[PDB]
C-alpha cells in the first residue's frame, strides 16, 4: 500500500474490455483492486483476453465465432466499440466510426475496421452491468452504485426490478442458489425442504433446499420453491430460488413509490424520509443470524462445567435452559439473557464462579440452532478445551431511523424520519408515497439515470409490465431512453384511462398533495417507482467505564469489549484552539489513564462531590520507565526554593 | 441593538443570506444571530416544501441550437482535417485548431445554456437551485444540459475527440471510457491527498505550537504594507478584505485632504476597511506577527483581532494552533486558449485602411494560418462602411486582415492577447 | 436513549441515590439493567443543562468539535442540527460522530461558555459567517422572494402594513409572487431601482408625491416625509417580517 | 429557558474583556453554589446570579 502510487492505481488504455474502469473500492484500496469485465477471460498463459467479431468490408461476421484477443494483439488493429449500429445482415451503418488504434481513440471509414466488440457492456463488470440507464450517470456515482449493490441485504420477500437491465437472470445462476429443472417433465413432490420432478419418461430427480442458514456476513441463505405439486415443468425452468432472487434473477431491493421534492428539512443533505408502510408491510425487513460460542476449558484449579447451578441467579432467569445448562431451540432471548450456563473453579460448595455466556447488549431474537461438540463425540476440539457450544440466534430487522438505503445509480441515504401514511404526500388517486428524496442531490451529483428509471418504473407499474433496458441504448436513435420512457408513459396513460398519470406539459411530473393539510404543492413533482436496496450493518456504541489496556491502562477500543472513542491529536489541537484547559486535562488524565484519579472522579460523581485534581497519567510513567530501560537517565526534578540547596529528584512511581 | 433592519426588496440567494447573517452578528450579537439563523432555516425549509421543487428529464433543458452549433463545429473540423490531409498544415496545427474549435464551441454552448435558462424558464428547478447557490455550479449544469467537452488521457494528453453529449442525452461507450479516466484520476487523488493534508497540518502545528499571546504591546513602530492582491489589470483580493482585524502602526490619511481616518494603534473593523477602500489609499501600514519584537511569540497589538469573535485577541490564546488549523483545513479542497485571448470581429462591411502604419511582420500562428504579428500598440484604422474604426491592438497581437480586402458581417478581423 | 443511559450512568446513579429511595449502588445498577420507568425520568432530569461535545472523525479545525445540549430521542442515530453540518463537513449518508461528556464543573462551564454551538458564528480562519443557511433553506428563501410573472393573482392591491399583507396572503386573496403595495415606513433596499423619481406630482397643496419604480413617497413642500409605500411581493414581505420579528423579540 | 441562559451567557462574555477569565469565574461560582447547597444545576444558577448582578 505504501509503495503503490498514482501511476499504478489509474486506468490503462489496455484495460478496455478486460478490467472494469468503474468498480473499485474507495479509500486506500482505490485502483489496487479491480473486477474482471463481463466478457473477459484468462487464457492458459495468464493474460486477460476479450472477444471480438470480425469485420470484412464493413460487414460484421456474427456467423463466425468470436475471436478472443489479448492487449498486445489488439494494438495494430482498428477495433470498434460494441455500441456501433449495423443494419440488416451485418453491414455497419454510418460514415465515420470510432475505433481504437495503438491505445488511442480515432475515427475511420467503416471499410477499415478490423474488429468490433461483442456487446456494449463488454467494458464494465457484472455489478456495473446491472445499472439501467448507466450512460446517463457520472462515473463516480456509477462506482458508488455498483459498490453499494454488493452491500444490499436479502429481504423477507424479494422482488424483481421493473427497469432491470437483462443481466439479472445471469448474475443469479452462477451463485448456485437457484434450482432449475434439467428435465422436461412433471413435478411430483413440493415441500419447504424438498422438491421432486419426474421425467416425462424417465427417472425421478430430487433436490433438497437450504433453510435459514447463515452466511459469512450474518445474512440468511434461505431457499424456497416456486412450483406447485403436479405442475408441468420444462427443462431450464426455475424450480427454486435463493434469498436475493425472485424467479430466476437477482432481486436485491424493492420497487416503491418515490417523489423528488424536499420535505420540512428531513431530506437535508442525503437524508431520506420514508413512509410507515415500509415497516408494517414488511418491505425492507430481513433476517440476520448471529453465532455465539462458549468454551469449556480446563484450569489449573479444575475443569469448567456447563450446568444450570449458576451462582447468584434466581429461577426466574433459568426458564429456557434444557436441564443441561444450555438454552433451548425456539426460545426468545433478550439482552443479557443467559445462553449457556458455565461455572469455573475459582480459588479463594460456595466455590464455583459464574462466567456463563449471555446475549450482548442490544441483541435479541430466537434461538434456531444449538450445536454441541465434545471430544467424546469424535470432534476436533481445541487443544485445551473440553466442550464447544455454538448457538445461533436469528432476528428480523425492519427499516428504521439510522439505516442506510441506496439505489443502483449511486444515491445513498440514511433514514431520518418514518411518517404515518396520513402525513406523507399523496397522489391524485389517494395513494400516499413511500419515499421522498431530495432533488437537490440529483444535479450536483450527475446521476440523472435515477430520474429515468423512476419514470419507466412508474410506467411498468401501470402497464403490468417489466422492462429490460440495456446500457448504452442510444445507438438506435438520437435520444432513445427519453423517447422510450415518454412512449411507455403515454401508453400507460392510454391503457389505464387516468389522465393524471402522464401530462404533456410536464412529462415526468404530476400533482401531489399534502397529507397534513390537504393542499396541493405549488408545482407538480416527479414521482415514479424506484428500486431501492437496504445495506448491511450494529454501529451504535457507548461507554462510561470498562476494560483497560495492559501496558498503558487506557480504555480498550472496540464495540465488542465496551471500548472507548479515541481522542486523537487533531481533537487535542481543536480543544487547544478553543482555549479549553479543563476539558482537555480531564480527558487526558481522569478519563483515560490516571489510575487513581479515575476511581476518585467516579466516586465523586456517584456521591455528588467535586472531582479532585488529577495526577500523572500512567502512560507518562510507562514512557519514563521505557526511556530508562533504553539506558537514558531521564528524570523529573523539583527546583530548590532557597539559594544553597540542590534540586531534588521527584519520585513519580509512588 | 437599536439598528433597524433594512427592508430587503430583492431576491435572496446564499450571498444575501450570508450578508444578512454577518450584519446581524455585527449589530446585534451572537445569540440574536443564532435566533435569526434558526428562523431563516425554518422559513426556507417550509417554503422549499410548499414550492414542490423537483427534478425531471424535461427540467434539464438543452438549447435548441445545440445541433446547429455542433454541425458548424464539425464543418470547421472537416475543413481543418482536409487541410491537414492535403499538406497545407502540419499535425500539431491540426491538433491545435481542433482543440481550440471544440473549446470555443463549448464556451458558446455554455453561454447559450445560461441564456436559455434565464430567458425561457427563469423558475426552472435546475436553474433555480444552481443560480441561487444552494446545490450546484456551472461546471455541472454544463455537463447535464450542455456538453462535456475535451477530456484528457490517463497521462495528461488532451484527447482530440471531445464528448459532445450531456448526461441527459447519454454518453457512448467511448465517451464513458474517456470520462472514467478522469473519474478514476480524481478518486485516487482524493485517496492519496488525505494523508498529505494530514501530514501538512501536523507539521504546521508542531512548527508553531508555542505561539501564544502573552503580552499586550511590545511597543514598536514596525509593520508591513497591506495592499490589494491584483493580477495586473484585475484585482483578486480587495484591500478592505485584507485590512480587517489589523492594527495600524501609523496614522492613515485620506489622499484628498487632511482628514484622518485612523490613528496609531487602532484595530480596523469592516466599516473602516470599507472607508479605506472607498477613499483609495491603496497601501496601509499595519502591525503584524512578522515584525513584532516580543518574547518568542506575538503580542496582542501586533496580532489584532481574533476572527471568530470580531474583537482583539484575549490573553493566553493559542494563535499558532489556530493558524495551523486554518491553513490545513482547506488542504483537502486543493482545453487550451479560449477566452484568455480575445478575437476581434467587425460587425460591418467595409474596405481595409490598414496601409503601412503599424509594424506588421508576417507570422504563422498557432494554427495553420498566416497573419501579421504586431508589437507596436497602434489604433486600427479601417473604412468600416458608415464610419471608421477605433479598434486598439496590443503588443504582441496577431491581425488576420490585411489591406485590400473585403470584410463582411461578423468576419474575423484580429486577435488580441489579454494580460518547446 | 441507549447511548445517553450509558454515558450518564454515574449521574443517574447519584440522582437515584439522593432524590429517591435507592439505598446502594448495586440496587441502582440492577434498576438500570432492568430498564425501570424511573430511570428515564431521572436521566431526562439529569442531562438537561449538561453540555455534551460532538466531534466528527476528521477534525480539521476547531469547529470539528462543538458543544450542544442533549435531547433524548428514540432511535439509534444522533440527530444533528442542519446549520452545523458545514462546520463539521458532515452529510447524512453514513457519517458518524463521537460524543463526549464533561464531568467537572469547570469542564461543563468551559463547554457551555466556549465550545457551545450557538456561539460559533464566524469562521476563526477568515471571520466570515459559518452558520449561514444552505441547500434547501437557500432554495426555499429564493423561491419565496423571487418574482414570478406567471402567477400574480391580486397584484396591485394596497395594504396597511406587513401583517395585513401576510394575512391576505395566508387567506389566499393575493398570490405569493404578486406585485402589491404595502405601507412600510423605514429603510428600503430594492434592486433594479432608480435614484431619480419616475413621476413627481404636486397636488393642490404643498405636498409632492414622488413615485419611484418600487416606492411612492409623499413629502411636504420643503418638508419631511408623510408616508412611504413599497412595491413588493408578499414573499419578500414574509421574509423581512420574519427577520424583523426575530430581531425585535 | 435555554434561550434566556444563552442571552445571559453572551451578556457576561461581553463587559468581561476575557472569555477565559469569566469562564473561570463562572466555574468557581457554580462550585461554591453546589458546595453550599448540598448542605437547577450549579453552572446555570451561577450564570443567572452573575447576570442579575451585572445590573
Amino acid at each position: 500500500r505504501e509503495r503503490a502510487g498514482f501511476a499504478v492505481r489509474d486506468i490503462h488504455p489496455s484495460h478496455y474490455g478486460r478490467i472494469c474502469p468503474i468498480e473499485t473500492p474507495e479509500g486506500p484500496n482505490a485502483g489496487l483492486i479491480g473486477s474482471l469485465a463481463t466478457h473477459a477471460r484468462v487464457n492458459d498463459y495468464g493474460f486477460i483476453e476479450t472477444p471480438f467479431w470480425r469485420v470484412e468490408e464493413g460487414r460484421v461476421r456474427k456467423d463466425l465465432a468470436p475471436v478472443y484477443m489479448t492487449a498486445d494483439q489488439e494494438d495494430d488493429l482498428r477495433v470498434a466499440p460494441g455500441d456501433v449500429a449495423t443494419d440488416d445482415a451485418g453491414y455497419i451503418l454510418g460514415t465515420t466510426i470510432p475505433v481504437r488504434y495503438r491505445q488511442d481513440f480515432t475515427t475511420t471509414t467503416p471499410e477499415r475496421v478490423d474488429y468490433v466488440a461483442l456487446s456494449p457492456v463488454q467494458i464494465i463488470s457484472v455489478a456495473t452491468s446491472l445499472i439501467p440507464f448507466l450512460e446517463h450517470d457520472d462515473a463516480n456515482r456509477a462506482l458508488m452504485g455498483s459498490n453499494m449493490q454488493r452491500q444490499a441485504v436479502p429481504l423477507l420477500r424479494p422482488e424483481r426490478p421493473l427497469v432491470g437491465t437483462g443481466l439479472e437472470p445471469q448474475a443469479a445462476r452462477d451463485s448456485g442458489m437457484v434450482i432449475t429443472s434439467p428435465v422436461d417433465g412433471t413435478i411430483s413432490y413440493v415441500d419447504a425442504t424438498h422438491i421432486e420432478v419426474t421425467a416425462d419418461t424417465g427417472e425421478k430427480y430430487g433436490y433438497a433446499l437450504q433453510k435459514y442458514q447463515r452466511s459469512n456476513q450474518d445474512t440468511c441463505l434461505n431457499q424456497r420453491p416456486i412450483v406447485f405439486e403436479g405442475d408441468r415443468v420444462q427443462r431450464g425452468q426455475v424450480i427454486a430460488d435463493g434469498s436475493a432472487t425472485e424467479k430466476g434473477e437477482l432481486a436485491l431491493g424493492q420497487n416503491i413509490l418515490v417523489a423528488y421534492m424536499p420535505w420540512e428539512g428531513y431530506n437535508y443533505e442525503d437524508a431520506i424520509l420514508i413512509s410507515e408502510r415500509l415497516v408494517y408491510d414488511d418491505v425492507y425487513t430481513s433476517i440476520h443470524i448471529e453465532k455465539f460460542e462458549i468454551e469449556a476449558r480446563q484450569t489449573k484449579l479444575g475443569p469448567e462445567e456447563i450446568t444450570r447451578e449458576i451462582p447468584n441467579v434466581g429461577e426466574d432467569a433459568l426458564r429456557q435452559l434444557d436441564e443441561n445448562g444450555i438454552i433451548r431451540v425456539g426460545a426468545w432471548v433478550e439482552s443479557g439473557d443467559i445462553l449457556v450456563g458455565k461455572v469455573t473453579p475459582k480459588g479463594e460448595a460456595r466455590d464455583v464462579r459464574d462466567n456463563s455466556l449471555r446475549v450482548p447488549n442490544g441483541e435479541k431474537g430466537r434461538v434456531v440452532d444449538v450445536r454441541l461438540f465434545t471430544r467424546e463425540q469424535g470432534d476436533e476440539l481445541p487443544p485445551g478445551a473440553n466442550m464447544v457450544v455454538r448457538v445461533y440466534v436469528a432476528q428480523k430487522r425492519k427499516i428504521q431511523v439510522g439505516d442506510k438505503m441506496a439505489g443502483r445509480h449511486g444515491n445513498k441515504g440514511i433514514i431520518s424520519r418514518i411518517l404515518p401514511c396520513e402525513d406523507m404526500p399523496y397522489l391524485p388517486d389517494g395513494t400516499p408515497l413511500d419515499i421522498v428524496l431530495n432533488p437537490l442531490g440529483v444535479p450536483s451529483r450527475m446521476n440523472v439515470g435515477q430520474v429515468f428509471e423512476c419514470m419507466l418504473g412508474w410506467a411498468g407499474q401501470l402497464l403490468d409490465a417489466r422492462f429490460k433496458v440495456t446500457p448504452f441504448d442510444e445507438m438506435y436513435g438520437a435520444e432513445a431512453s427519453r423517447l422510450t420512457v415518454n412512449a411507455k408513459l403515454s401508453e400507460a396513460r392510454e391503457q389505464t384511462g387516468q389522465p393524471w398519470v402522464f401530462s404533456d406539459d410536464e412529462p415526468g411530473k404530476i400533482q401531489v398533495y399534502d397529507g397534513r393539510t390537504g393542499e396541493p404543492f405549488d408545482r407538480p413533482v416527479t414521482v415514479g417507482r424506484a428500486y431501492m436496496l437496504k445495506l448491511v450493518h450494529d454501529k451504535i456504541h457507548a461507554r462510561s467505564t470498562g476494560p483497560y489496556s495492559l501496558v498503558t491502562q487506557q480504555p480498550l477500543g472496540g464495540k465488542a469489549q465496551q471500548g472507548g472513542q479515541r481522542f486523537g491529536e487533531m481533537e487535542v489541537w481543536a480543544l487547544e484552539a478553543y482555549g479549553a484547559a479543563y476539558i482537555l486535562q480531564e480527558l487526558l488524565t481522569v478519563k483515560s489513564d490516571d489510575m487513581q484519579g479515575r476511581n476518585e472522579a467516579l466516586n465523586a460523581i456517584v456521591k455528588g462531590k467535586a472531582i479532585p485534581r488529577p495526577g500523572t497519567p500512567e502512560s507518562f510513567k510507562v514512557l519514563m520507565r521505557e526511556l530508562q530501560s533504553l539506558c537514558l537517565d531521564i528524570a523529573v526534578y523539583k527546583a530548590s526554593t532557597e539559594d544553597y540547596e540542590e534540586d531534588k529528584e521527584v519520585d513519580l512511581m509512588a | 441593538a437599536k439598528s433597524a433592519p433594512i427592508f430587503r426588496n430583492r431576491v435572496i440567494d446564499k450571498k444575501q443570506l450570508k450578508k444578512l447573517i454577518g450584519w446581524t452578528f455585527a449589530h446585534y450579537g451572537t445569540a440574536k444571530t443564532a435566533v435569526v439563523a434558526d428562523d431563516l432555516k425554518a422559513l426556507g425549509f417550509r417554503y422549499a416544501t410548499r414550492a414542490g421543487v423537483s427534478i425531471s428529464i424535461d427540467d434539464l433543458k438543452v438549447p435548441g441550437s445545440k445541433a446547429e452549433l455542433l454541425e458548424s463545429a464539425e464543418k470547421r473540423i472537416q475543413e481543418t482535417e482536409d487541410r491537414y490531409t492535403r499538406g497545407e498544415i502540419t499535425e500539431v496545427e491540426r491538433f491545435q485548431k481542433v482543440i481550440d474549435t471544440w473549446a470555443n464551441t463549448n464556451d458558446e454552448l455554455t453561454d447559450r445554456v445560461v441564456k436559455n435558462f434565464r430567458e425561457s424558464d427563469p423558475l426552472n428547478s435546475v436553474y433555480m437551485m444552481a443560480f441561487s447557490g444552494a446545490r450546484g455550479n456551472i461546471s455541472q449544469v454544463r455537463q447535464l444540459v450542455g456538453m462535456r467537452g475535451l477530456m484528457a488521457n490517463p497521462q495528461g494528453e488532451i484527447i482530440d475527440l471531445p464528448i459532445k453529449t450531456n448526461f441527459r442525452e447519454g454518453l457512448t461507450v467511448t465517451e464513458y471510457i474517456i470520462s472514467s479516466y478522469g473519474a478514476r484520476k480524481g478518486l485516487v487523488d482524493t485517496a492519496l491527498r488525505t494523508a498529505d493534508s494530514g501530514y501538512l497540518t501536523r507539521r504546521l502545528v508542531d512548527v508553531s505550537q508555542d505561539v501564544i499571546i502573552h503580552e499586550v504591546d511590545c511597543g514598536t513602530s514596525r509593520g508591513l504594507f497591506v495592499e490589494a492582491m491584483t493580477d495586473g489589470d484585475r484585482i483578486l483580493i480587495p484591500i478592505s478584505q485584507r485590512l480587517l482585524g489589523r492594527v495600524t502602526a501609523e496614522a492613515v490619511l485620506d489622499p484628498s485632504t487632511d482628514e484622518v481616518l485612523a490613528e496609531a494603534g487602532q484595530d480596523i473593523n469592516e466599516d473602516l476597511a470599507n472607508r479605506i477602500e472607498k477613499a483609495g489609499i491603496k497601501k496601509v501600514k499595519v502591525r503584524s506577527p512578522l515584525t513584532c519584537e516580543a518574547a518568542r511569540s506575538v503580542c496582542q497589538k501586533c496580532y489584532g483581532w481574533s476572527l471568530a469573535h470580531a474583537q482583539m485577541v484575549d490573553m493566553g490564546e493559542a494563535v499558532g494552533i489556530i493558524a495551523a488549523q486554518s491553513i490545513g483545513e482547506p488542504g483537502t479542497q486543493l482545453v487550451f486558449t479560449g477566452e484568455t485571448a480575445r478575437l476581434l470581429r467587425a460587425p460591418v462591411a467595409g474596405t481595409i485602411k490598414l496601409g503601412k502604419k503599424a509594424r506588421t511582420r508576417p507570422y504563422r500562428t498557432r494554427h495553420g494560418e498566416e497573419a501579421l504579428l504586431a508589437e507596436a500598440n497602434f489604433d486600427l484604422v479601417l473604412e468600416g462602411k458608415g464610419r471608421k474604426e477605433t479598434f486598439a491592438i496590443l503588443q504582441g497581437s496577431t491581425i488576420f486582415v490585411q489591406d485590400g480586402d473585403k470584410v463582411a458581417a461578423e468576419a474575423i478581423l484580429a486577435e488580441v492577447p489579454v494580460s518547446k | 436513549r441507549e447511548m445517553a443511559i450509558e454515558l450518564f450512568q454515574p449521574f443517574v446513579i447519584h440522582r437515584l441515590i439522593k432524590n429517591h429511595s435507592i439505598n446502594n449502588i448495586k440496587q441502582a445498577k440492577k434498576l438500570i439493567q432492568k430498564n425501570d420507568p424511573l430511570i428515564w425520568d431521572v436521566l431526562e432530569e439529569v442531562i438537561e443543562g449538561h453540555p455534551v461535545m460532538l466531534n466528527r472523525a476528521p477534525t480539521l479545525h476547531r469547529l470539528g468539535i462543538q458543544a450542544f445540549e442533549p435531547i433524548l430521542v428514540e432511535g439509534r442515530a444522533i440527530q444533528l442540527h442542519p446549520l452545523v453540518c458545514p462546520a463539521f463537513n458532515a452529510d447524512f449518508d453514513g457519517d458518524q460522530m463521537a460524543v463526549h461528556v464533561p464531568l467537572s464543573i469547570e469542564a461543563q462551564a468551559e463547554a457551555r461558555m466556549l465550545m457551545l454551538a450557538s456561539g460559533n458564528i464566524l469562521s476563526p480562519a477568515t471571520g466570515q459567517p459559518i452558520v449561514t443557511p444552505s441547500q434547501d433553506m437557500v432554495l426555499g428563501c429564493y423561491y419565496l422572494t423571487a418574482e414570478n410573472p406567471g402567477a400574480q393573482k391580486g397584484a396591485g392591491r394596497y395594504f396597511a402594513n406587513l401583517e395585513d399583507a401576510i394575512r391576505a396572503f395566508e387567506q389566499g386573496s393575493v398570490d405569493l409572487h404578486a406585485w402589491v403595495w404595502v405601507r412600510f415606513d423605514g429603510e428600503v433596499e430594492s434592486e433594479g431601482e432608480s435614484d431619480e423619481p419616475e413621476s413627481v406630482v404636486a397636488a393642490d397643496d404643498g405636498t409632492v408625491t414622488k413615485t419611484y419604480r418600487f416606492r411612492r413617497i409623499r413629502e411636504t413642500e420643503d418638508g419631511q416625509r408623510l408616508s412611504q409605500y413599497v412595491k413588493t411581493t408578499p414573499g419578500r414581505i414574509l421574509f423581512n417580517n420574519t427577520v424583523q420579528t426575530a430581531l425585535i423579540h | 429557558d435555554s434561550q434566556d441562559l444563552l442571552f445571559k451567557a453572551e451578556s457576561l462574555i461581553v463587559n468581561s474583556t476575557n472569555r477565559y477569565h469569566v469562564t473561570l469565574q463562572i466555574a468557581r461560582r457554580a462550585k461554591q453554589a453546589r458546595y453550599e447547597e448540598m448542605e437547577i444545576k450549579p453552572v446555570l444558577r451561577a450564570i443567572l446570579e452573575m447576570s442579575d448582578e451585572l445590573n
Binding site: 479549553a580 484547559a581 482537555l584 486535562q585 488529577p614 495526577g615 500523572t616 | 490564546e317 494552533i321 | - | -
Partner: peptide, 16 residues
C-alpha cells in the same frame, strides 16, 4: 508538554 505530562495547558483558561 503539559499535554504529554498531563497539566493545564498554558493557553486559554489555563493561562495563569
Amino acid at each position: 508538554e503539559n499535554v504529554i505530562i498531563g497539566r493545564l495547558i498554558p493557553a486559554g483558561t489555563g493561562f495563569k
